[PDB]
Design a protein around this ligand. Structure first.
Ligand SMILES: O=C(O)COc1ccc(-c2ccc(F)cc2F)cc1
Ligand SMILES: [Ca+2]
Lengths: 20, 89
């Protein structure tokens, strides 16, 4: 299964991956 | 002892506390009354490369929330962050 999220990982994708 | 991760959530620091607030509104922009729900979390899930069903995130909201709303509020969002953020010791 590939389901897991980290605080820094989710934050980096929240305001970084096609966001900011 | 217990309540170790929540102890940091209650104390914490403005630098990290305000950060969770700025990272919370973007997660839940149009979800009920400003609470990250299964649909809001699924939006960021697609950015990583996976599109799971709403039930997958419903289990995530139940693990961190159980007040009847079934939605990640500002506190639950910051409480879920320290859970995977580990401690400093
Ligand atoms: O803590 C564990 O073992 C389970 O892993 C986790 C999976 C997803 C999240 C998570 C993060 C941001 C968000 F907006 C919605 C979320 F569900 C948090 C933790
Ligand atoms: Ca709640």
């Amino acid at each position: 299964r590939r389901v897991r999220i980290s605080a820094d990982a989710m934050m980096q994708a929240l305001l970084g991956a096609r966001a900011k | 002892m217990d309540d170790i991760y929540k102890a940091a959530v209650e104390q914490l620091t403005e630098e990290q506390k305000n950060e969770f607030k700025a990272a919370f509104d973007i997660f839940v922009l149009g979800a009920e009354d400003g609470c990250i729900s299964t649909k809001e979390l699924g939006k960021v899930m697609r950015m990583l490369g996976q599109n799971p069903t709403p039930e997958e995130l419903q289990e995530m909201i139940d693990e961190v929330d159980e007040d009847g709303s079934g939605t990640v509020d500002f506190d639950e969002f910051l409480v879920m962050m320290v859970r995977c953020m580990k401690d400093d010791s």
